[PDB]
Symmetry: D2
């Protein structure tokens, strides 16, 4: 049976060691700084039990068990679109894609292991044959069985970008002890999203020139593993849900994980020791976060275009021709994201293990296109609003016997409903003019590497050549 | 048979009255200023007789007749993809999409009439029951039977944009007589591409506020109709095909058409008199040419990105990290044009007559995306080339006993083949640094309306509202009633 | 003598009727939500008593009295640059232009009345000869004598932009009674910055098609005038000045002003009744704010560029060639703002009253250049920082016995000083990733009209003609 | 006496060895592919004899000799503005800066040698003391006395950018012999503008990593020197001055210069042998070109803004609110170019020999801002024009008895003067839609290095650091 939100909230009180800013958290489920986002994860579990949402949110496995669609493997295009429809519905149900690391996103990358588990084993170095491909699949099947949230921590510390030789002093997680039972790791996974809210840490690494084998670690450990400390930025959750209808729903915390001589049994180790394996295989893990990112980009673009339509109608600028072509840019951006999502699904291919994967070039350049344009799209939405994005009644001002009459008249545009402008303003302010909204903009910018990173890695991986089928047309037109 | 290139060249010498700059043209087929682009249209006809392309270029109709795919109707997605592959093959064969108004593009717009002819008739005003839906279909079948090129002239004179009342004085084509046999028209179809190379003129209008009813004319007349004069800009064809391998292939002339009391029989009149009809129906005619524009935008973006890969490889900048992220911009643009074309095909719908149409929002916003970015993408290609885009040996300089050794060494980059940098330069120069090239850029910018018009017209036609689909998620998030 | 901060804070306890969000404010000088920005105005007054700053902050008037430079009139280029060095020093001393409506800015616009007071009187309609030019000059000499902060409220309600016929239903402030003693005004000045912190409201209006005579009001009244209510957005001030060294310094509130049958004596009315007068004259009042905006833009661009130099040096990206050209964008933007400032001062002209005014075209197109670019410049600073702009230790995380050694290694870039990355993070985050910093971005975007309005008003006022000296070069090249 | 156009044309027939595309040129003065641009240089000389221009075009030296202002040294801001007015007048008189390498531009860079000749001598390696500062001054005085055009050729071959080793296989000009009379140079100066039209070649080089001593050459040699071959791109001059009123005026040819064992006496060698000397000193020579570029940029932007004003008035779009804000962008761009020119003049400094040099950062960042925006500004001008930029009557079509009536009515917008739209179209088409105009855009893009190069080279030269006066405001705000 599928986990409930109540079971998830109970499970959070497991002794995990967690800083949120200056404070220690006794219980992530109940602490003021964490309880609203924890309840957003609780809401995610409870969506799967809804009889009205069952056909979208669940599937019947070959054994006849109803399971959550976060565990659904896609082997053709129809099945990919069914998975995409699930992810899309989850983000619409949760404050218009305002919580981008729900468990469905975290656990999606596990499919790279399921698809082709052998290389993780065969390419391992210094494990003395202890790592079994069979044991990776058994862990992922365990996660599925208990609807466990595995939060992915791969990225390096941002220590010193001047040196290629600065991966020896780096506090990056290292294997300090290999024995008969497992590994002992010491150091830091420098960055992760929502680990304080997860069940297990999915530990990984990306290749950087000169990475030592003792820092090449793929594994899983519980969030309450002795020697694990979760260290998070201050919570940006807001007290008043009337003034802050989105930001009061909770803050998806980011931070680092300190490992103090942490023991991981070989059963929960996926791969150690091979920098060459860390070149391509970790990209294949993160490809699924990258495809999902496009589903989010389409939904964010749709929300932004909708808010521009609502605000320009409510202040009455929507028929001004020069405003009409500015709304067109925000609508065209949404259509562009939609087009990349649909085309990447059309031009997909089968992986080694028979999973259907969307076209890498289309979704990854679709991500570059979003990051290139998104700050300008935020500028357009806010600029189109005028003052209505920020200078609007608080609720007790609106309802005051003296002020009400003035506010109703000041907000009386062509689609009447004066208070609706305050509702639009609250959402624009929360999304784009609060620390809470700013974190999400920063998250979109970095989580999948920033623009100059997406372009570089996309070119390195594609290995585009004048002699390859790109330059076919150019060579023919040139007489070459 | 399908018409041949040589039949086309013979057909051109039909007494049509043609200016090309300061010169009159005796025979468009043979005149130095026109014969090259005439030969590109002959090449287009001859692609349909190439045995290795038979399956891409022709189909068998329900009567067992092999015909040019330019006449093929698409009723599902599979059929639309076979028509797109035909258009794409034509532009790839024809100098990397350097000739955007070959007959397959011109004739594509006629499918709107074939799909739903009746409203052209029913909505006409003042024709006294003479216009017949069946006669529109009969003309379009006659064009198909003879593989005739119907060049579309719709757009108004650019006279005075200050006030709609100024259209009182507009020299735009007007009905000046209606009789039992047909109409007489007098004035100008102010702008058209390739009319000097076509068989028939396809006349129409777009609504602009205060367009006079006497200027709402949809019809067809031969290019050599008595009273018609074709008046074209100067030809930009280049003499030396070694130095200009693209611009020596000919210049797709644009210009205006003068109609002096031209008689058109009712049989060749599709619609008169109704400004309301000219709002939605002409946009449905040009939908097919906007979809085709997406195919051209993909192929052109592919060419630019390819040229950027070739020149950065040859001068040896391609592994410099800063240059690599700039080439990724050009490749990403191509991938975005690819995404819009595929997505528009996937999200299409059936027209009232059962034709499958690609998604209007996607191809039109894709066109807007292209016009917004293309100037910057040409800058990038030229800027990535450095001096190699412009400052290179002429062929006699290259082959000189004294200069060859210096040129060979000056062009000796990581992929050897020194003379190849000149081959790449020639193409970059022709496309983006000659009059011939700039005309194509200006064509792409204006032919399907410019960026601000694309945006205006797409919004007006779509009428997106807070209470429609674009408001649903925002209304939910804001807690606003549906 | 020149007002002190202590006198200012004492003067706020005057009965003024003030909302800040859902709360009524007992005393703007002492209330938790207002006291910090009130102390920022007190610091402003105190800067004029600092002996090392006397030459820059004060001048000796013809009477031999020392006065604040906010009262200095400039009749030549040298005098303009001396005024500009004062404004520049104020915003540098006050958190790098983080408080853009200090009294020196508010009061700057009064110079337009001083330069040529008569037309305000003579072009008035319906005042029965009660309005006197000498009284306008007397009010402004009174503000000077007492160092009074006159907050300008001119802009209309954002009610309904669909209609030029909106002006009929406008809750905009209107004259409801005229008698022998003065006018009674009823309705709203819909938007103003810092009015809760000012002494007087400078009332005025901009022309709009069909503006009725009864809404053409230029006047001044105390903030504590009976029937005046100040209604402000919620305060964005932060409690912890270690985590938030800028946002803890106070929030420059924006809001509206309600007038309920408010009496203004004729002596404090500058002009009523003439729509035509409201076309060009209000633009001449606000010219001084537009010139001043170029000084702030320069200082803001210099801060952004410097923050980019500091963070790229500290994370070790400053010598990566592709980062060096990005940093060059931010520096070039600063030089562009400096270039417009200096050029506006060089190409100035004398007004009717003999004041020296900088080049309108250079400073207004300068403001347009700033709003076209600033969003992308912030995107660039944040993007250049990577995670360091958001994910950094709180102070108690930093100093913890366990986490300190990890934090010090993770922040050990090429210029040592690990903790300085947290220092730089905190400023980037206050400025562009908090509620507080976002208000300043929105203020900059709208206070002097947004980009499309700057362009439209500049073109409308300039009346550029093909036949004018503008197009002479084009005419000669064309042979027209 | 100042040189005349006639003396200059006479001097071109001196046996210089010139390719223009596939053709050898008997005489640059009279050949169809060269005579028009040679006549533009003749017009340059003849401008200095127009009695109405003598005050702008000439000055009286200490001796009492009247000379061309191209030889005027500026020792203060007032003298610099006088030199700028000269350069501005030349480019306004000559088809609105369509001919950017007139002799006044070429010869401006000689001022760096005059200001401080000693270092060129003292830093020379391997010349055995034969190079003398006095001879450098003697050559530049000889150029002045005879009004000689010294065309600068510094930039390297663009052979292979992948390799720093690339400097050994380089066909770049190298010293193959040194004797007691002078040097023999063999190789290529790979790029120059207008050398076929010049009197002398001014040879220089810029530093690149691993440049050998034997390629560090600064010298002067006649264009007709035995063993010099000038190899030019094909000429883009147009035949019909009515259809092409700018492109028929001549094509400013670009090309390479071949040296086969060319002898240069020590008397005309400025420096050899020191790669370190080639780091900063060549940048000081080209500074004057970079400042001059800012004058051209202002004139070009003024021409583009004027054409937009002219064409929008003629077609009747000039009052459409949405077009009005587009034209504001082009006018804004001109004002920005004006601001940088003026500010650079205002914020200049004295060189070691006491010449006044304008602010390097402002003029080099001004060039960056121009190259970043120019392509968008061309797009806007062409887009604002509609078909009128390209599709217009030829003169014989216009004057045809049948076609005239139709063309008059088609071009009868709100300011009448139908044929004037053709006059405007012809200039837009020549500048931005011909071979000839595109060469000028390309020239503007590359001649002072392209955008990414300006940014990289300006940052490397400035040595901006967080601890420097740059980062003072940011350090203060951060509490560092
Ligand atoms: C809010 C949030 C949330 C998450 C994460 C980040 C953030 C901000 N991350 C980590 C994230 O992927 C990481 O921040 C980005 O890859 C960017 O890396 P750095 O922050 O180290 O900047 P970095 O120092 O790499 O880059 C900083 C700037 O310099 C530029 N630059 C750096 N080197 C360059 C070069 N050689 N050439 C050109 N330009 C260069 C970059 O392009 C960028 O603009 C993460 N990770 C994870 O594994 N799991 C997670 O759940 C999350 N979640
Ligand atoms: C933070 C802050 C602080 C202040 C102020 C605002 C704000 C936000 N203001 C008022 C400020 O000047 C005002 O917000 C701007 O001029 C914008 O006016 P609206 O808010 O009504 O937008 P408005 O409704 O005018 O504009 C909305 C958007 O639509 C566009 N648009 C509207 N009409 C258009 C048209 N006809 N053509 C094309 N585009 C059009 C605008 O360009 C903009 O993008 C103010 N005022 C004051 O007097 N004293 C003060 O101290 C302050 N302080
Ligand atoms: O100008 N503005 O108001 C803006 C611009 C960008 C942004 O992210 C937020 C607000
Ligand atoms: O090649 N270079 O280093 C150059 C070239 C031209 C210039 O104006 C400055 C520097």
């Amino acid at each position: 049976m599928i986990r409930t939100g109540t079971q998830y909230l109970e499970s959070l009180n497991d002794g995990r060691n967690v800083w949120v800013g200056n404070e220690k958290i006794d219980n992530v489920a109940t602490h003021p700084k964490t309880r609203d986002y924890a309840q957003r994860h609780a809401d995610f579990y409870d969506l799967h039990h809804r009889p009205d949402l069952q056909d979208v949110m669940t599937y019947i496995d070959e054994g006849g068990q109803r399971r959550a669609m976060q565990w659904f493997g896609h082997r053709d295009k129809e099945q990919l679109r069914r998975k995409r429809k699930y992810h899309e519905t989850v983000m619409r149900e949760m404050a218009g894609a305002s919580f981008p690391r729900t468990p469905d996103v975290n656990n999606y990358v596990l499919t790279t292991y399921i698809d082709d588990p052998a290389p993780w084993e065969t390419q391992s170095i210094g494990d003395d044959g202890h790592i079994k491909a069979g044991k990776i699949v058994d862990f992922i099947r365990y996660a599925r069985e208990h609807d466990l949230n595995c939060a992915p921590q791969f990225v390096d510390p941002q220590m010193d970008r001047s040196n290629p030789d600065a991966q020896e002093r780096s506090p990056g997680l290292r294997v300090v002890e290999k024995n008969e039972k497992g590994i002992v790791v010491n150091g830091v996974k420098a960055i992760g999203t929502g680990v304080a809210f997860a069940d297990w840490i999915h530990i990984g690494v990306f290749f950087r020139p000169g990475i030592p084998g003792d820092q090449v670690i793929f594994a899983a450990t519980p969030v309450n593993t002795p020697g694990v400390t979760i260290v998070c930025r201050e919570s940006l959750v807001k007290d008043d849900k009337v003034e802050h209808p989105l930001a009061a729903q909770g803050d998806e915390l980011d931070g680092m994980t300190v490992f103090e001589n942490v023991f991981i049994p070989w059963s929960h180790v996926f791969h150690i020791g091979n920098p060459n394996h860390a070149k391509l295989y970790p990209q294949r893990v993160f490809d699924w976060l990258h495809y999902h990112a496009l589903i989010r980009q389409m939904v964010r673009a749709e929300l932004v275009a909708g808010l521009a339509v609502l605000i320009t109608e409510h202040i009455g600028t929507n028929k001004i021709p020069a405003v009409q072509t500015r709304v067109a840019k925000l609508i065209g951006f949404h259509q562009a994201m939609l087009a990349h999502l649909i085309a990447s699904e059309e031009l997909g291919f089968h992986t080694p293990g028979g999973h259907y994967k969307p076209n890498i070039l289309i979704y990854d350049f679709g991500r570059a296109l979003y990051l290139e344009n998104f700050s300008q799209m935020i500028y357009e939405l806010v600029d189109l609003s005028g003052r209505s994005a920020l200078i609007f009644a608080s609720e007790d001002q609106w309802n005051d016997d003296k002020l009400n009459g003035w506010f109703e008249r000041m907000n009386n545009g062509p689609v009447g409903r004066p208070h609706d402008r305050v509702k639009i303003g609250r959402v624009i302010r929360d999304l784009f003019l609060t620390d809470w909204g700013s974190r999400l903009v920063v998250f979109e910018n970095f989580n999948g590497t920033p623009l100059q990173g997406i372009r570089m890695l996309t070119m390195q991986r594609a290995e585009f050549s004048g002699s390859g089928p790109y330059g076919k047309l150019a060579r023919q037109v040139c007489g070459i």
